């Protein structure tokens, strides 16, 4: 499913992402925009053979099992396909563990490169939250 901006903002808020670990909602919405373009079915393969899955492009080498990434750790204990569902719950729960990993949102390269230090507030502007 391809979420609309405010729709995703509201769903993420309901799932406890607004200000989780100090990151305002605008950061999470900005990250989804640049990571998947709000599309839950987005996948991208990396050169190391691992694959990024879903709305937040979570990596198979550490967070989920896709049965084809040798040495994968499956820290969120879920098959990677669960991260592509229209219900963002699995994605959100796993993202919570990732952002708590000690490196914050820098774990998401698109966030670091395109959201970090920008007026992330613009991403939730106009939304009924």
Short mmCIF file of N, CA, C and O in Angstrom, two decimals, residues 41-120:
data_model
loop_
_atom_site.label_atom_id
_atom_site.label_comp_id
_atom_site.label_asym_id
_atom_site.label_seq_id
_atom_site.Cartn_x
_atom_site.Cartn_y
_atom_site.Cartn_z
N UNK A 41 5.39 -2.00 -0.04
CA UNK A 41 5.95 -3.11 -0.80
C UNK A 41 7.32 -2.88 -1.39
O UNK A 41 7.81 -3.73 -2.15
N UNK A 42 7.95 -1.75 -1.08
CA UNK A 42 9.27 -1.45 -1.62
C UNK A 42 10.39 -2.40 -1.15
O UNK A 42 10.47 -2.77 0.03
N UNK A 43 11.19 -2.88 -2.10
CA UNK A 43 12.33 -3.72 -1.74
C UNK A 43 13.49 -3.23 -2.57
O UNK A 43 13.30 -2.72 -3.67
N UNK A 44 14.69 -3.35 -2.03
CA UNK A 44 15.90 -2.95 -2.76
C UNK A 44 17.01 -3.86 -2.32
O UNK A 44 17.16 -4.11 -1.13
N UNK A 45 17.72 -4.44 -3.27
CA UNK A 45 18.81 -5.34 -2.93
C UNK A 45 20.12 -4.56 -2.86
O UNK A 45 20.34 -3.61 -3.62
N UNK A 46 20.98 -4.96 -1.94
CA UNK A 46 22.27 -4.30 -1.77
C UNK A 46 23.38 -5.15 -2.34
O UNK A 46 23.17 -6.33 -2.62
N UNK A 47 24.57 -4.58 -2.49
CA UNK A 47 25.69 -5.35 -3.06
C UNK A 47 26.17 -6.47 -2.18
O UNK A 47 26.68 -7.45 -2.70
N UNK A 48 26.00 -6.34 -0.87
CA UNK A 48 26.42 -7.41 0.03
C UNK A 48 25.43 -8.59 -0.02
O UNK A 48 25.54 -9.52 0.76
N UNK A 49 24.46 -8.54 -0.93
CA UNK A 49 23.50 -9.63 -1.04
C UNK A 49 22.28 -9.50 -0.14
O UNK A 49 21.31 -10.23 -0.32
N UNK A 50 22.34 -8.60 0.83
CA UNK A 50 21.21 -8.38 1.73
C UNK A 50 20.13 -7.57 0.98
O UNK A 50 20.38 -7.10 -0.13
N UNK A 51 18.95 -7.42 1.57
CA UNK A 51 17.87 -6.69 0.92
C UNK A 51 17.18 -5.80 1.96
O UNK A 51 17.16 -6.15 3.14
N UNK A 52 16.73 -4.63 1.54
CA UNK A 52 16.01 -3.70 2.42
C UNK A 52 14.52 -3.89 2.11
O UNK A 52 14.12 -3.92 0.95
N UNK A 53 13.70 -3.92 3.16
CA UNK A 53 12.27 -4.17 3.01
C UNK A 53 11.31 -3.16 3.61
O UNK A 53 11.46 -2.72 4.75
N UNK A 54 10.28 -2.85 2.85
CA UNK A 54 9.23 -1.99 3.32
C UNK A 54 9.36 -0.50 3.37
O UNK A 54 10.33 0.08 2.91
N UNK A 55 8.36 0.08 4.02
CA UNK A 55 8.18 1.50 4.25
C UNK A 55 9.43 2.16 4.84
O UNK A 55 9.76 3.28 4.47
N UNK A 56 10.13 1.46 5.73
CA UNK A 56 11.33 2.02 6.33
C UNK A 56 12.62 1.36 5.85
O UNK A 56 13.69 1.62 6.41
N UNK A 57 12.50 0.50 4.84
CA UNK A 57 13.65 -0.19 4.22
C UNK A 57 14.59 -0.88 5.22
O UNK A 57 15.80 -0.66 5.20
N UNK A 58 14.02 -1.74 6.06
CA UNK A 58 14.76 -2.46 7.07
C UNK A 58 15.59 -3.58 6.42
O UNK A 58 15.08 -4.36 5.60
N UNK A 59 16.87 -3.64 6.78
CA UNK A 59 17.84 -4.60 6.23
C UNK A 59 17.82 -6.04 6.73
O UNK A 59 17.84 -6.30 7.93
N UNK A 60 17.94 -6.96 5.79
CA UNK A 60 17.90 -8.38 6.11
C UNK A 60 19.15 -8.96 6.77
O UNK A 60 19.10 -10.07 7.30
N UNK A 61 20.27 -8.25 6.73
CA UNK A 61 21.49 -8.77 7.37
C UNK A 61 21.44 -8.79 8.92
O UNK A 61 22.02 -9.67 9.55
N UNK A 62 20.65 -7.89 9.50
CA UNK A 62 20.55 -7.79 10.96
C UNK A 62 19.18 -7.91 11.58
O UNK A 62 19.03 -8.42 12.68
N UNK A 63 18.17 -7.39 10.89
CA UNK A 63 16.83 -7.29 11.46
C UNK A 63 15.74 -8.28 11.15
O UNK A 63 14.87 -8.51 11.98
N UNK A 64 15.77 -8.87 9.96
CA UNK A 64 14.72 -9.81 9.59
C UNK A 64 15.30 -10.96 8.79
O UNK A 64 16.44 -10.89 8.33
N UNK A 65 14.55 -12.04 8.70
CA UNK A 65 15.01 -13.19 7.96
C UNK A 65 14.28 -13.32 6.62
O UNK A 65 13.05 -13.33 6.58
N UNK A 66 15.04 -13.36 5.53
CA UNK A 66 14.45 -13.52 4.21
C UNK A 66 14.93 -14.82 3.59
O UNK A 66 14.74 -15.07 2.40
N UNK A 67 15.60 -15.62 4.42
CA UNK A 67 16.10 -16.90 3.99
C UNK A 67 17.14 -16.89 2.91
O UNK A 67 17.48 -17.95 2.39
N UNK A 68 17.71 -15.73 2.57
CA UNK A 68 18.71 -15.70 1.51
C UNK A 68 19.86 -14.74 1.79
O UNK A 68 20.53 -14.28 0.87
N UNK A 69 20.09 -14.43 3.06
CA UNK A 69 21.16 -13.52 3.45
C UNK A 69 22.03 -14.26 4.46
O UNK A 69 21.72 -14.30 5.65
N UNK A 70 23.12 -14.88 3.99
CA UNK A 70 24.03 -15.63 4.86
C UNK A 70 24.62 -14.78 5.98
O UNK A 70 25.11 -13.68 5.73
N UNK A 71 24.50 -15.27 7.21
CA UNK A 71 25.00 -14.55 8.36
C UNK A 71 24.01 -13.55 8.96
O UNK A 71 24.38 -12.77 9.84
N UNK A 72 22.78 -13.54 8.45
CA UNK A 72 21.73 -12.66 8.94
C UNK A 72 21.46 -12.93 10.42
O UNK A 72 21.42 -14.09 10.84
N UNK A 73 21.21 -11.88 11.20
CA UNK A 73 20.95 -12.03 12.63
C UNK A 73 19.49 -12.06 13.10
O UNK A 73 19.22 -12.48 14.23
N UNK A 74 18.56 -11.64 12.26
CA UNK A 74 17.12 -11.62 12.59
C UNK A 74 16.77 -11.06 13.98
O UNK A 74 15.93 -11.62 14.70
N UNK A 75 17.30 -9.88 14.29
CA UNK A 75 17.07 -9.25 15.59
C UNK A 75 15.64 -8.85 15.89
O UNK A 75 15.28 -8.72 17.04
N UNK A 76 14.82 -8.66 14.87
CA UNK A 76 13.41 -8.32 15.11
C UNK A 76 12.55 -9.58 15.10
O UNK A 76 11.35 -9.51 15.33
N UNK A 77 13.19 -10.73 14.85
CA UNK A 77 12.54 -12.04 14.82
C UNK A 77 11.25 -12.08 14.04
O UNK A 77 10.17 -12.33 14.58
N UNK A 78 11.38 -11.84 12.75
CA UNK A 78 10.25 -11.81 11.85
C UNK A 78 10.76 -12.06 10.44
O UNK A 78 11.93 -11.77 10.11
N UNK A 79 9.92 -12.68 9.59
CA UNK A 79 10.38 -12.89 8.22
C UNK A 79 10.30 -11.49 7.59
O UNK A 79 9.42 -10.67 7.95
N UNK A 80 11.19 -11.20 6.65
CA UNK A 80 11.17 -9.89 6.02
C UNK A 80 9.86 -9.54 5.30
O UNK A 80 9.49 -8.36 5.20
N UNK A 81 9.12 -10.55 4.84
CA UNK A 81 7.85 -10.32 4.13
C UNK A 81 6.81 -9.63 5.00
O UNK A 81 5.93 -8.94 4.49
N UNK A 82 6.90 -9.85 6.31
CA UNK A 82 5.99 -9.21 7.27
C UNK A 82 6.14 -7.68 7.21
O UNK A 82 5.21 -6.95 7.50
N UNK A 83 7.33 -7.21 6.85
CA UNK A 83 7.62 -5.78 6.74
C UNK A 83 7.00 -5.10 5.52
O UNK A 83 7.09 -3.87 5.38
N UNK A 84 6.34 -5.88 4.66
CA UNK A 84 5.75 -5.35 3.44
C UNK A 84 4.23 -5.28 3.47
O UNK A 84 3.58 -4.94 2.47
N UNK A 85 3.67 -5.62 4.62
CA UNK A 85 2.24 -5.62 4.84
C UNK A 85 1.66 -4.20 4.79
O UNK A 85 2.37 -3.24 5.00
N UNK A 86 0.36 -4.07 4.54
CA UNK A 86 -0.26 -2.75 4.54
C UNK A 86 -0.35 -2.22 5.98
O UNK A 86 -0.50 -1.02 6.19
N UNK A 87 -0.34 -3.12 6.96
CA UNK A 87 -0.36 -2.77 8.38
C UNK A 87 1.11 -2.54 8.78
O UNK A 87 1.91 -3.48 8.84
N UNK A 88 1.47 -1.30 9.09
CA UNK A 88 2.85 -0.98 9.43
C UNK A 88 3.34 -1.41 10.80
O UNK A 88 4.50 -1.16 11.14
N UNK A 89 2.51 -2.09 11.58
CA UNK A 89 2.91 -2.51 12.93
C UNK A 89 4.28 -3.22 13.05
O UNK A 89 5.11 -2.81 13.86
N UNK A 90 4.54 -4.24 12.25
CA UNK A 90 5.83 -4.94 12.34
C UNK A 90 6.98 -4.00 12.04
O UNK A 90 8.01 -4.04 12.71
N UNK A 91 6.80 -3.19 11.00
CA UNK A 91 7.81 -2.24 10.58
C UNK A 91 8.11 -1.27 11.71
O UNK A 91 9.26 -1.02 12.03
N UNK A 92 7.05 -0.75 12.33
CA UNK A 92 7.21 0.18 13.44
C UNK A 92 7.92 -0.44 14.64
O UNK A 92 8.85 0.15 15.19
N UNK A 93 7.51 -1.65 15.02
CA UNK A 93 8.12 -2.33 16.17
C UNK A 93 9.61 -2.62 15.96
O UNK A 93 10.42 -2.56 16.90
N UNK A 94 9.97 -2.99 14.74
CA UNK A 94 11.34 -3.27 14.41
C UNK A 94 12.14 -1.96 14.37
O UNK A 94 13.24 -1.88 14.89
N UNK A 95 11.56 -0.91 13.79
CA UNK A 95 12.23 0.38 13.72
C UNK A 95 12.55 0.88 15.14
O UNK A 95 13.59 1.51 15.38
N UNK A 96 11.64 0.59 16.07
CA UNK A 96 11.86 0.96 17.47
C UNK A 96 13.14 0.33 18.03
O UNK A 96 13.85 0.97 18.79
N UNK A 97 13.41 -0.92 17.68
CA UNK A 97 14.63 -1.59 18.14
C UNK A 97 15.88 -1.00 17.43
O UNK A 97 16.95 -0.85 18.03
N UNK A 98 15.75 -0.74 16.14
CA UNK A 98 16.84 -0.17 15.35
C UNK A 98 17.27 1.21 15.91
O UNK A 98 18.43 1.41 16.24
N UNK A 99 16.31 2.12 16.07
CA UNK A 99 16.59 3.47 16.56
C UNK A 99 17.14 3.48 17.98
O UNK A 99 17.77 4.46 18.40
N UNK A 100 16.91 2.39 18.72
CA UNK A 100 17.40 2.25 20.08
C UNK A 100 18.78 1.58 20.09
O UNK A 100 19.41 1.50 21.13
N UNK A 101 19.26 1.18 18.92
CA UNK A 101 20.53 0.49 18.78
C UNK A 101 21.77 1.32 19.12
O UNK A 101 22.90 0.83 19.03
N UNK A 102 21.59 2.59 19.47
CA UNK A 102 22.74 3.40 19.83
C UNK A 102 23.19 4.39 18.78
O UNK A 102 23.95 5.31 19.08
N UNK A 103 22.72 4.24 17.54
CA UNK A 103 23.11 5.17 16.48
C UNK A 103 21.95 6.04 16.03
O UNK A 103 22.08 6.87 15.14
N UNK A 104 20.81 5.87 16.69
CA UNK A 104 19.65 6.66 16.37
C UNK A 104 19.18 6.46 14.95
O UNK A 104 19.35 5.39 14.35
N UNK A 105 18.62 7.52 14.39
CA UNK A 105 18.07 7.47 13.05
C UNK A 105 19.11 7.49 11.94
O UNK A 105 18.76 7.38 10.77
N UNK A 106 20.38 7.59 12.33
CA UNK A 106 21.50 7.61 11.37
C UNK A 106 21.60 6.25 10.69
O UNK A 106 22.30 6.09 9.70
N UNK A 107 20.91 5.27 11.26
CA UNK A 107 20.83 3.92 10.71
C UNK A 107 20.17 3.98 9.33
O UNK A 107 20.34 3.07 8.52
N UNK A 108 19.35 5.00 9.11
CA UNK A 108 18.67 5.18 7.84
C UNK A 108 19.43 6.23 7.04
O UNK A 108 19.34 7.43 7.33
N UNK A 109 20.15 5.76 6.02
CA UNK A 109 20.96 6.63 5.17
C UNK A 109 20.18 7.78 4.51
O UNK A 109 20.73 8.88 4.37
N UNK A 110 18.93 7.54 4.10
CA UNK A 110 18.15 8.61 3.47
C UNK A 110 17.79 9.67 4.51
O UNK A 110 17.71 10.84 4.19
N UNK A 111 17.61 9.26 5.77
CA UNK A 111 17.29 10.20 6.84
C UNK A 111 18.49 11.11 7.07
O UNK A 111 18.39 12.33 7.14
N UNK A 112 19.64 10.47 7.23
CA UNK A 112 20.89 11.16 7.47
C UNK A 112 21.18 12.15 6.33
O UNK A 112 21.43 13.34 6.56
N UNK A 113 21.02 11.68 5.10
CA UNK A 113 21.31 12.52 3.96
C UNK A 113 20.27 13.51 3.50
O UNK A 113 20.62 14.53 2.90
N UNK A 114 19.01 13.26 3.80
CA UNK A 114 17.98 14.16 3.30
C UNK A 114 17.01 14.73 4.31
O UNK A 114 16.25 15.63 3.97
N UNK A 115 17.04 14.24 5.54
CA UNK A 115 16.11 14.72 6.56
C UNK A 115 16.79 15.42 7.69
O UNK A 115 16.30 16.46 8.15
N UNK A 116 17.84 14.79 8.20
CA UNK A 116 18.63 15.32 9.29
C UNK A 116 18.98 16.80 9.07
O UNK A 116 19.42 17.20 8.00
N UNK A 117 18.66 17.62 10.06
CA UNK A 117 18.96 19.04 9.97
C UNK A 117 18.08 19.89 9.07
O UNK A 117 18.40 21.05 8.81
N UNK A 118 16.99 19.34 8.57
CA UNK A 118 16.10 20.09 7.72
C UNK A 118 14.85 20.40 8.56
O UNK A 118 14.73 19.93 9.69
N UNK A 119 13.95 21.21 8.04
CA UNK A 119 12.73 21.53 8.77
C UNK A 119 11.80 20.32 8.60
O UNK A 119 10.88 20.34 7.77
N UNK A 120 12.03 19.28 9.39
CA UNK A 120 11.22 18.06 9.28
C UNK A 120 9.76 18.30 9.62
O UNK A 120 8.88 17.56 9.18
#
